[PDB]
Amino acid sequence: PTPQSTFTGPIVVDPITRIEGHLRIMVEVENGKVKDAWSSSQLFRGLEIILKGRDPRDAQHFTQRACGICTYVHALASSRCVDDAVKVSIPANARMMRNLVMASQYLHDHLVHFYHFHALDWVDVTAALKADPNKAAKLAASIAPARPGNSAKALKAVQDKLKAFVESGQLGIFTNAYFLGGHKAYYLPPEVDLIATAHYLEALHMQVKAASAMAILGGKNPHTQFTVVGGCSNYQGLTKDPLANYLALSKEVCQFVNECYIPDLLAVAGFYKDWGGIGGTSNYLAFGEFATDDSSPEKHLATSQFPSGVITGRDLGKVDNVDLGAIYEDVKYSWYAPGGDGKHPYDGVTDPKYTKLDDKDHYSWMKAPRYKGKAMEVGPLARTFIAYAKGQPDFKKVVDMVLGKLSVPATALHSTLGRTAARGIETAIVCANMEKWIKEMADSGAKDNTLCAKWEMPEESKGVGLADAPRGALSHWIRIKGKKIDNFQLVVPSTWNLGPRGAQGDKSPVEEALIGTPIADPKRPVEILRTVHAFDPCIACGVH
Amino acid sequence: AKHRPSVVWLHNAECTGCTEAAIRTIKPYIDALILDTISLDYQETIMAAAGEAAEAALHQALEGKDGYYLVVEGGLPTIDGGQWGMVAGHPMIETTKKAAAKAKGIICIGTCSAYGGVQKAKPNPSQAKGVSEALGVKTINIPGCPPNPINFVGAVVHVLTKGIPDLDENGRPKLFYGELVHDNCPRLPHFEASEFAPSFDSEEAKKGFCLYELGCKGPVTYNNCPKVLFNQVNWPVQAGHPCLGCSEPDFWDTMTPFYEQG
Numbered sequence A: 001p002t003p004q005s006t007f008t009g010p011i012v013v014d015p016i017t018r019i020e021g022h023l024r025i026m027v028e029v030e031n032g033k034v035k036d037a038w039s040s041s042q043l044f045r046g047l048e049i050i051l052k053g054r055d056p057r058d059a060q061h062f063t064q065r066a067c068g069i070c071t072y073v074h075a076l077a078s079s080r081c082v083d084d085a086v087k088v089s090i091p092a093n094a095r096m097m098r099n100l101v102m103a104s105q106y107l108h109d110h111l112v113h114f115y116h117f118h119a120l121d122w123v124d125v126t127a128a129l130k131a132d133p134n135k136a137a138k139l140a141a142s143i144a145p146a147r148p149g150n151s152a153k154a155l156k157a158v159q160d161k162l163k164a165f166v167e168s169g170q171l172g173i174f175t176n177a178y179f180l181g182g183h184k185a186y187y188l189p190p191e192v193d194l195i196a197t198a199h200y201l202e203a204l205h206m207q208v209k210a211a212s213a214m215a216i217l218g219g220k221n222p223h224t225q226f227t228v229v230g231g232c233s234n235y236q237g238l239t240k241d242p243l244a245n246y247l248a249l250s251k252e253v254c255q256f257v258n259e260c261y262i263p264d265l266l267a268v269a270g271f272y273k274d275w276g277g278i279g280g281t282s283n284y285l286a287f288g289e290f291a292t293d294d295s296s297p298e299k300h301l302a303t304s305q306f307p308s309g310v311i312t313g314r315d316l317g318k319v320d321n322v323d324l325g326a327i328y329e330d331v332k333y334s335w336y337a338p339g340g341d342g343k344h345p346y347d348g349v350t351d352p353k354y355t356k357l358d359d360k361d362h363y364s365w366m367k368a369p370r371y372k373g374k375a376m377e378v379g380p381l382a383r384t385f386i387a388y389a390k391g392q393p394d395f396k397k398v399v400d401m402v403l404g405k406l407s408v409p410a411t412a413l414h415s416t417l418g419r420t421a422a423r424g425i426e427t428a429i430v431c432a433n434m435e436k437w438i439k440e441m442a443d444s445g446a447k448d449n450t451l452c453a454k455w456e457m458p459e460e461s462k463g464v465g466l467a468d469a470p471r472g473a474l475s476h477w478i479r480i481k482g483k484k485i486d487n488f489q490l491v492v493p494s495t496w497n498l499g500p501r502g503a504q505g506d507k508s509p510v511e512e513a514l515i516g517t518p519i520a521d522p523k524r525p526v527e528i529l530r531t532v533h534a535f536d537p538c539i540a541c542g543v544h
Numbered sequence B: 001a002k003h004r005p006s007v008v009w010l011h012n013a014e015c016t017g018c019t020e021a022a023i024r025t026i027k028p029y030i031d032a033l034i035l036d037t038i039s040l041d042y043q044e045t046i047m048a049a050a051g052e053a054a055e056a057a058l059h060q061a062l063e064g065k066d067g068y069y070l071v072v073e074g075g076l077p078t079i080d081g082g083q084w085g086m087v088a089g090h091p092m093i094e095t096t097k098k099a100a101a102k103a104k105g106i107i108c109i110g111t112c113s114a115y116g117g118v119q120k121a122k123p124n125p126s127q128a129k130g131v132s133e134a135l136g137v138k139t140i141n142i143p144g145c146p147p148n149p150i151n152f153v154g155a156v157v158h159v160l161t162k163g164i165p166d167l168d169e170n171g172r173p174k175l176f177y178g179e180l181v182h183d184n185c186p187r188l189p190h191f192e193a194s195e196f197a198p199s200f201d202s203e204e205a206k207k208g209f210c211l212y213e214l215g216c217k218g219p220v221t222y223n224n225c226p227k228v229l230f231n232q233v234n235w236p237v238q239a240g241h242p243c244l245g246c247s248e249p250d251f252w253d254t255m256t257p258f259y260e261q262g
């Protein structure tokens, strides 16, 4: 039975920690259950405003700085955007290289999210100190692949290091943790806490390697520097030695995914099976990613290996094609000027206007993206439902595997547990595809090393750039006039998931997902974190 | 138990790329740094506590008897009484002001905290400023967008164990920022011989010719990128792309257009 108090009243959590950026969550609680919610983004920067009048070639370098967690993705979306505006189709090698860098980003981003952002909501680190390192090793030898990191010796060494750290009195990043002293909402046995904590620390080393792999093609991480209008600049990234080192690093990262991430995920999901009934939404959108034909946005949507689509009312029998004309953003409940509702991004307007904290009429720096009046969840769970519904072979196999291991129906994936599982599921699938994708590019680049197409700047034009970033459906939209930026609008996965109410007063995905959240302890409302963290919030992304 | 120096890390108007850069450190790795070298006592990106718990961890850090060092990531949005950038219902400018007041030292990680950064670029709708400017305090600047973790962690270690490092006119440690990117660039002999790529599709580009004609800002940018590389493997020019000048103050406006020299 899921713990829940009798608490009735408001709860504000600000800051929401272990996300990117600046988020305030406000809820009304009755009888220990959330009955209303508000997602309030607390920073504005105004990149869209900054871009006005600038060189379209410069856009990618500004927009990349929307986010350093989902680094790269905005540079890619802007490049796709401007390629489409100047009507250039990139060479095959450039499509391949840009897509591999995205694959590398997914691996880095998802791994860090699970361990370093999300796990502390489910894992009680201090209780790891109660475990017998030997019983824990035994448990790990029965729920996971054999590995030296999982030995009694290795787990004792982890425990010893943590013990010395805690007994020092300087708890650092664990100061005032919601799990300190025990918490009713934390179910894991001490042994699982120890295993997960050991992997948390290993993950801190492994993400360096994931980033090195990414930097071989991207030039550096964070903030890649290899994309240009018409393709890519990195001729060395098509050669044999760097691609062999890229393959090897990727294999090490994927071994860690298969040995640690997925088994930890499934163990947590096993103990928190009640969270498969908490935090569901109904509508899903993806632009798709990993396309075999990126010559146009329409081709991207059509040929993405992680497919695009639109699911409404949880109906997996009816995946609709993406209508890019049906996207618009409202500002009714946002800190922008009157009269900006219902704008398609090509006609987007960014006129900031602040009021006051917790003004129920205006409470976020995020706009509210809508699709034919409806809010849309984007991200791994959206991609997973869409791919599954379309019978994408890798997704079908892995989803059904997870469902078989957990003994739950596919309908239990419309939940915070599902959202968390989905992130792991697609990580395994990206990992399974890496060697094939690298071989494709090595083989292609060795026959011909064309990486960038010739192009000309038009006087007046418009273009859209689509990508499914780690957090979901991302689009950059440009109006060019006089060879300059006349308008540049970003509509970002977190804007979809975490923005405020639309013009109809309808709650966003995160706000909807928060309703019915049980709160065991209003002093320490970890359940709010669990659902919010599950969406992988990125506020600098959502607001830009 | 040996007491480890307290570090408070504040996030203002930023993209969290500097936090991400920092955790790419391998000398030492971040786990070893925070378990053995420092006491990282507030850090929104990775800390366990949230909301009021987190706010109280900050207060506890700020009132620590042994004092603390301050790391600041991001610029300060000053329009409307600082209300366009808030944490825990307080303007970023207000919290950074209060934390700076008693800090043993202030390290600005990234071009944003150092100089104002991307949000400060024209027309600067949020009236964003760098820290030194907004608060009136001396900062140790570790710029770049993001800086190399070698530079940040090196500065942090140096300040904890040796003192304040020698700084150039822009507040940057000469240890890392003393030389131009250009002076250590392997394409330099191409530059000297006027061997330039005219476009990215050209045979000259394939041959690794200099990128000056394609807007490279190495000749006017102080950083150690070609010497230390990023992620142990690469840097932008090696990846065939011009330097953006991203460690220079206000580069968003002084270095643009990026693909030109005008």
Ligand code: SF4
Pocket (backbone or CB within 6 Å): A065, A068, B013, B014, B015, B016, B017, B018, B073, B074, B109, B110, B111, B112, B113, B117, B118, B144, B145, B146, B147
């Ligand atoms: S300096 Fe660059 S990487 Fe660092 S916070 Fe500012 S925009 Fe992000």
Ligand code: SF4
Pocket (backbone or CB within 6 Å): B181, B182, B183, B185, B186, B187, B188, B189, B191, B209, B210, B211, B212, B216, B217, B218, B219, B237, B242, B243
């Ligand atoms: S590519 Fe840039 S840093 Fe290198 S020699 Fe040419 S101008 Fe200098």
Ligand code: FCO
Pocket (backbone or CB within 6 Å): A067, A070, A073, A074, A469, A470, A471, A472, A474, A492, A493, A494, A495, A537, A538, A541, A542
């Ligand atoms: N992934 C990611 Fe960042 C967000 N939200 C983007 O785009």
Ligand code: F3S
Pocket (backbone or CB within 6 Å): B144, B145, B181, B221, B223, B225, B235, B236, B237, B242, B243, B244, B245, B246, B247
């Ligand atoms: S863009 Fe920045 S990271 Fe180095 S190569 Fe130029 S200073």
Ligand SMILES: [Mg+2]
Pocket (backbone or CB within 6 Å): A048, A367, A489, A490, A491, A543, A544
């Ligand atoms: Mg926008």
Ligand code: NI
Pocket (backbone or CB within 6 Å): A020, A066, A067, A068, A069, A070, A071, A538, A541
């Ligand atoms: Ni992001």
